[PDB]
Write a protein that binds this ligand. Sequence first.
Ligand SMILES: [K+]
Ligand SMILES: [K+]
Ligand SMILES: [K+]
Ligand SMILES: [K+]
Ligand SMILES: [K+]
Ligand SMILES: [Mg+2]
Ligand SMILES: [Mg+2]
Ligand SMILES: [Mg+2]
Ligand SMILES: [Mg+2]
Ligand SMILES: [Mg+2]
Ligand SMILES: [Mg+2]
Ligand SMILES: [Mg+2]
Ligand SMILES: [Mg+2]
Ligand SMILES: [Mg+2]
Ligand SMILES: [Mg+2]
Ligand SMILES: [Mg+2]
Ligand SMILES: [Mg+2]
Ligand SMILES: [Mg+2]
Ligand SMILES: [Mg+2]
Ligand SMILES: [Mg+2]
Ligand SMILES: [Mg+2]
Ligand SMILES: [Mg+2]
Ligand SMILES: [Mg+2]
Ligand SMILES: [Mg+2]
Ligand SMILES: [Mg+2]
Ligand SMILES: [Mg+2]
Ligand SMILES: [Mg+2]
Ligand SMILES: [Mg+2]
Ligand SMILES: [Mg+2]
Ligand SMILES: [Mg+2]
Ligand SMILES: [Mg+2]
Ligand SMILES: [Mg+2]
Ligand SMILES: [Mg+2]
Ligand SMILES: [Mg+2]
Lengths: 394, 101, 238, 124, 336, 181, 46
Amino acid sequence: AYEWGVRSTRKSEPPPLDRVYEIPGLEPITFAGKMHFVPWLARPIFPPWDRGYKDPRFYRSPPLHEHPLYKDQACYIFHHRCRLLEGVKQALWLTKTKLIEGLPEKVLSLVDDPRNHIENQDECVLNVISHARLWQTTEEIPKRETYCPVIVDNLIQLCKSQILKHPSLARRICVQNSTFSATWNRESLLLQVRGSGGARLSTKDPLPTIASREEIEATKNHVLETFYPISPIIDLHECNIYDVKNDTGFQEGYPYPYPHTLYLLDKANLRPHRLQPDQLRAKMILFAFGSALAQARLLYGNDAKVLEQPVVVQSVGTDGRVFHFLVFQLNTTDLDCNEGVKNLAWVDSDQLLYQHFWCLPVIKKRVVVEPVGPVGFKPETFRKFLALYLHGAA
Amino acid sequence: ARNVVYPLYRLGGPQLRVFRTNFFIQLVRPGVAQPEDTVQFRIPMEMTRVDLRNYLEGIYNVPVAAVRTRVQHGSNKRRDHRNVRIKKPDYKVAYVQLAHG
Amino acid sequence: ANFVSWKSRTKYTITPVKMRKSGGRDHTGRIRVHGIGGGHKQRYRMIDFLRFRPEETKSGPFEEKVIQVRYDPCRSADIALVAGGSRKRWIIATENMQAGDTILNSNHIGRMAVAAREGDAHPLGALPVGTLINNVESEPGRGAQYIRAAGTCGVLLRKVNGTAIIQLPSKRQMQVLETCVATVGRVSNVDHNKRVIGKAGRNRWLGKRPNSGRWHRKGGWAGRKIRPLPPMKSYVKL
Amino acid sequence: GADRMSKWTSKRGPRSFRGRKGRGAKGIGFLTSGWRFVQIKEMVPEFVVPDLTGFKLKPYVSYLAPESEETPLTAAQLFSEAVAPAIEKDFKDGTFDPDNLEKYGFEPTQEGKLFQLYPRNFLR
Amino acid sequence: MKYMVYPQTFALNADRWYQYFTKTVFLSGLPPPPAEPPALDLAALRAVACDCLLQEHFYLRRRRRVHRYEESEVISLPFLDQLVSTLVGLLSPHNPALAAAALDYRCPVHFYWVRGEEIIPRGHRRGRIDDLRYQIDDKPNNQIRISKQLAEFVPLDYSVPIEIPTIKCKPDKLPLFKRQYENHIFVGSKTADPCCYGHTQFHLLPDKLRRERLLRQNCADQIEVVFRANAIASLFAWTGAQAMYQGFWSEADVTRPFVSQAVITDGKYFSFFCYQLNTLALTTQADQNNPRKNICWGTQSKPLYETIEDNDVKGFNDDVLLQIVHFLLNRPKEEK
Amino acid sequence: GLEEFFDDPKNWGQEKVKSGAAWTCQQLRNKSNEDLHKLWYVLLKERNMLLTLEQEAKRQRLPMPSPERLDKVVDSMDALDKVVQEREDALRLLQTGQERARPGAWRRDIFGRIIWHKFKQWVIPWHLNKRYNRKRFFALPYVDHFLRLEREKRARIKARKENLERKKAKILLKKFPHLAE
Amino acid sequence: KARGNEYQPSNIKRKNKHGWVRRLSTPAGVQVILRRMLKGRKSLSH
RNA sequence: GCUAAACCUAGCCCCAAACCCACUCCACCUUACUACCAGACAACCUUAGCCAAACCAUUUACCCAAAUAAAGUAUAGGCGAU
RNA sequence: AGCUACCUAAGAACAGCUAAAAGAGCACACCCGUCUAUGUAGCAAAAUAGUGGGAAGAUUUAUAGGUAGAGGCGACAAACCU
RNA sequence: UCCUCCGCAUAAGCCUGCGUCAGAUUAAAACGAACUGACAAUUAACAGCCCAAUAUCUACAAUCAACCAACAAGUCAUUAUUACCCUCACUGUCAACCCAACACAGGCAUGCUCAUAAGGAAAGGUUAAAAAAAGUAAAAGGAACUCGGCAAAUCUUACCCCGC
Ligand SMILES: [K+]
Ligand SMILES: [K+]
Ligand SMILES: [K+]
Ligand SMILES: [K+]
Ligand SMILES: [K+]
Ligand SMILES: [Mg+2]
Ligand SMILES: [Mg+2]
Ligand SMILES: [Mg+2]
Ligand SMILES: [Mg+2]
Ligand SMILES: [Mg+2]
Ligand SMILES: [Mg+2]
Ligand SMILES: [Mg+2]
Ligand SMILES: [Mg+2]
Ligand SMILES: [Mg+2]
Ligand SMILES: [Mg+2]
Ligand SMILES: [Mg+2]
Ligand SMILES: [Mg+2]
Ligand SMILES: [Mg+2]
Ligand SMILES: [Mg+2]
Ligand SMILES: [Mg+2]
Ligand SMILES: [Mg+2]
Ligand SMILES: [Mg+2]
Ligand SMILES: [Mg+2]
Ligand SMILES: [Mg+2]
Ligand SMILES: [Mg+2]
Ligand SMILES: [Mg+2]
Ligand SMILES: [Mg+2]
Ligand SMILES: [Mg+2]
Ligand SMILES: [Mg+2]
Ligand SMILES: [Mg+2]
Ligand SMILES: [Mg+2]
Ligand SMILES: [Mg+2]
Ligand SMILES: [Mg+2]
Ligand SMILES: [Mg+2]
């Protein structure tokens, strides 16, 4: 088979050893005593050198197999950069969860009452879009690495203005730079989710359970869809040096220990560096499951069992224009088997807040065809965003 | 010190010490208006602004707050009678600001 | 000169690799091949020509799913991203290969001949006589070196004494061991040879520089020559 | 058209050249990621300045000073003045052996000393 | 070619020079409170402030070593981000304006102006008049913009018996360096944004200007200078940019004052400032007979806490937190 | 303080400032190392002050008062260096026997010349030092002819110089014919 | 068109083409230095 | 009457004799004269041609270890030039 | 091979109008150099004025590197290689 | 009064090359000085100067990136474990400037200004011959000029040869 790496680019082989070395009982006269190369003396054989002390800028790590945390069994790690080939279907299998299309009626009813609507909601949201896409910087056309984080921050700020109507909204904070870890087994495969990036909306109170005990028991019939010949662990980081860490990201005693929403961004400027919609939704499911599992392992121990009190975690994933909404309920920690009570995930996909934005006027033959500003604004998208925020408070 | 070899430092080694320094400096009158707290020097080329701070504080007990330096080019334009260029030497200028008002 | 081949990568990947143009120069910096230069920048997608490469810890026949069929700037034929188990790789696409298809990479030679599906990789011994093949290897495990261009196909002519006789696109016969693996069907882009360049500029985009303006009198080499097909080329040692 | 005769300095050449060449100042640290310079305190020369209070020697010497003959110090003279007296005294006492040469001040090796004479590892 | 004025500066006594460039008189203390004709929960505000302090310092687990040189960006910067975010949410009932305010994170603020003239000393332009141009490129860690202007602290013609300091040498001796590039006047958003007025800015001093390092360089008396210089330059640029968004400039001086507030901190010590812009007529021509002066009020920096031992905040200072709340409670006067 | 960079304020404007003699090597050889260490800084501050005055004299386009003061301080400081160096050299010889503080070796360079190569300090051994191994400490045969030409150039110069002296000695006897003895 | 301006100075080019290191990189270049040394040139190389 | 004119030294040439050969500190093979980091490349291999032969094509003196002499002899050579 | 021929690495520039598809047209910047006059020890060892060809392309262009004379390079003009 | 062909800045190049004082040396003219001697000067935030190891990861252009349609198929991305407590050094910074033997009507990349807020002066004085150069206007005629409508003016018809 074709071998990669042409020989001319490979390290040259050591030069032929001087034949004086072959002769037994003969001591070669080399240039080592001279401390420099000469063509007419033999090449010295130098013994291996060891610095003998610690120099951090010239450190060399030990061989991989000799690391203390090296294990023969591989742990497949899903981190913020992992892009699943099969998208949600792969995530559904890994987390032993059943998918329901659309958000829960409990959540969506919160914004059906016009008393919960923000004052001048449509105008307020439109200004947020215009700020992020146009007025933000000194540059004519803000880039996605710029407006995507800001559009999410300002929308959360808009929702946070409702502390007046709902005093319970003062019991939550938006935390940055938090990370979490959870390990579990699926069909004898060791899996780990390491969550990082985005914003963690943290509450003092746990989110109400969504599904009744009757729906949780009705998931026993559901069969997880398989996708032979692709393995469930494709696109995961196969690691052989790891610790079985279960971490919520905070030390004991943190006033806001409960994860409420996980805001995940896909802000890369280049399209090939942005997750596809299905891949982003898969990341949301795994991150929501990871946060929920870390909470369950903390509160209810490391045992494998159907949870008497399900853990509910939400996630909002966006690239700045398209929004995805997830409500995840962790019903069980007995994940190694494919049969039994399954977790539940409510997913509302591909919710366009706006179709397009014109930063400059479109002038054809000295006539302004399109004005600057958002095109195709959908207020329903923000209504779902507000409903998820209001969940657990209003 | 100048025109001497500095002992090589490695992590965890002794402090480098100079006992008889051969750096000599001359305090000069500024050619342009300067702030009241600013003192101008012409120092050796190999002397750093860090050296001058410790040099002025250690030998003269002058409290220094800031030190800035620049390298002045000496003119190489003049010509001797053989039409050979004569180099006015380059020199380093330092600007020392006094500390406690 | 200081020429260093860009072909230094040692580990297989599906990430497009930055490649450097030669201009028809060799390592000495002198022109070795005329008519090469410029053209659009291109990235190299590493093609796996060994269709039967079981995963590290696996063995025997295995299946793969076609993820995408796409344009390849470095070759005439289209290429297909295939995934099986936890591995993804680029391969040469067949005429009717499309996303969502499943392909079978087997090394099994059975008493009976298999029903040949386009895009499947089988040993030549396992294929019915007359099957249209592509991406053939001269020796078992060497990897495909023949019938790789757009629309090209060979035909399995005979199977004798554990060997297979195939007709190459040039029509010259080729004897190989029956264990040499081939792919069923024609290569993608059957209408490649019908493309029209249209203008001199498009040849420049493809990295082709104009011909010399020097007039060369034609010699005895020129003129139609009717020669017999060369004798069958054999890679089997008896 | 270039000036071959003039000294090559950091003022000449493009931006990359001008920033790589210096004026002979000894380094006091290293550059880390982000071009962040890390100053090492031990690499900065520390001026050991003595207390000059009640010091009676002045920059110049009085002209009414008797001339003396110049006698440069030698290894022999230093040995006779510093080492020979102790060796002569122990010789009379009757307890002298090569093993005790370290007692008289001989240093078999320079390694392990803070100030090593050869290779010299200290500044003037 | 224009001077690059850095609000956060290593230059000694830069506050005095910045007063000259901006024609700003500095006053110790905060502005005189206006005598004119809901319950504040101090326990709740203190709790969240301590919760934000302990989160960054203790509770939040860091995957990577936090080195001393990274502490400002890794620890202090998230603190000030969250502290400003939670307080404005909690204080919306007391201050309705906050609910509709825009909260920016590290958004540029630019101001360009002309102050003074010089005679070109050298070259083919020697002997000709050249304006002294200045540019401030600031990045406040946080800031709050509102759609209605805050009330003036004092009258537009307010006079003080305090002369603005003068410089007897070139600005280059501060030191200050010249460069030529785009002249930007920017309040944090483009002119189309309705939130064109400034409420409060929150600044975090960089590691280069850390208290511990100033004491090591014999610059103990520059600790307060660094706060004052950053306040004067930042708020002059912000209020100046606000006035020019309303159409005012050197030849059309402001007809009403433009005020703003700043909170300057290094993560532990907090200093509070108020700035009133009374005049943009800073050119030689427009300042010839201009009695107006810009005013800046400032307090001495005070520690918000003493130490943080494990999960306990030692010596939390309620007065410093109260001062932060008072600025956030400022609101425009409602018209009849 | 900064006043030490200037002479006594009473001496400002005086045409001459009387000074003593420069320290001699023998006078300094009687002093302890600690005394010589203190004297170095006493001489250093005088040197800085005199260098300060010399520059200001040029700035004012006036003669420097008593310029010999600087020459005396430089001679004193050179004598102090020599005394301290002699003591260190004697100690190095006794304890090590090495005539030089800095290690070195006689080497042939790429040009065929014999040079004393002063060693430098390194953290890694020489056989691993990429830059060091690029240096050529040997000469190839093509250098041989150039060495001969250089030798012959030296011989020509020496021959002309010797012949000229003999010519001059004869011109001398012609002018003064009483030097036969 | 008009000639005479063939010299387009570049310190990088000058040093790389005619520098000390370049001269010493080949025996012919070393001999260049040896000839200039024998003639007594003040400037052995760029 | 201007412009000029005039000069005797500097040194140099050829032989003889004699073998020849440097050094303060610091810097210098990377872009020489650049304090301070992981390399490993390494030297040898017939001179040609002008020119003469009245072109040119084989051929055409070039210190090689004692001045002289043997001797421009033996001998070589388009048996020509040499 | 700091000019120039071709190439390699990674950069940069291209208004307005028409058509809106363009080795498309008009037309700046920019590249080129058709015709005439001037100039001819000139401003210039190839220029100036006007007039012209092209100007999103096989375009133009800054930077570093490569190919060397029994050779290179060449959309062959025996071009170009200070 | 009149020009604006520019201008300012960066890069590259150059290297003190119209700052002060003192000299009457001089600018293709001229006592201001780019020439001489002396004395001054450019101050880092801009820029240059960067990075511990091993394995592992990186299919999905750009074009307001959204519709739409493409080919010549494209400039920007990691994780795992180990190691790591420290701090602001060094260098460029002037000018009327470079490549063209010149204080040369030539050559010279990028940003901004799009006609200027920046930068500049076509006439040493006089006279008002010829010949010469660059322009403007011209009775009647309108290519009769000439190798040719070259040039100028105006601004258009049809055709042929060759080469797509
Ligand atoms: K293709
Ligand atoms: K002939
Ligand atoms: K080249
Ligand atoms: K210059
Ligand atoms: K010209
Ligand atoms: Mg500097
Ligand atoms: Mg190709
Ligand atoms: Mg052809
Ligand atoms: Mg042809
Ligand atoms: Mg020339
Ligand atoms: Mg060029
Ligand atoms: Mg002949
Ligand atoms: Mg002939
Ligand atoms: Mg070139
Ligand atoms: Mg290329
Ligand atoms: Mg265009
Ligand atoms: Mg075109
Ligand atoms: Mg055209
Ligand atoms: Mg060509
Ligand atoms: Mg021809
Ligand atoms: Mg011809
Ligand atoms: Mg910087
Ligand atoms: Mg400048
Ligand atoms: Mg050009
Ligand atoms: Mg002007
Ligand atoms: Mg004139
Ligand atoms: Mg004239
Ligand atoms: Mg005249
Ligand atoms: Mg007429
Ligand atoms: Mg006619
Ligand atoms: Mg007609
Ligand atoms: Mg006629
Ligand atoms: Mg015409
Ligand atoms: Mg044609």
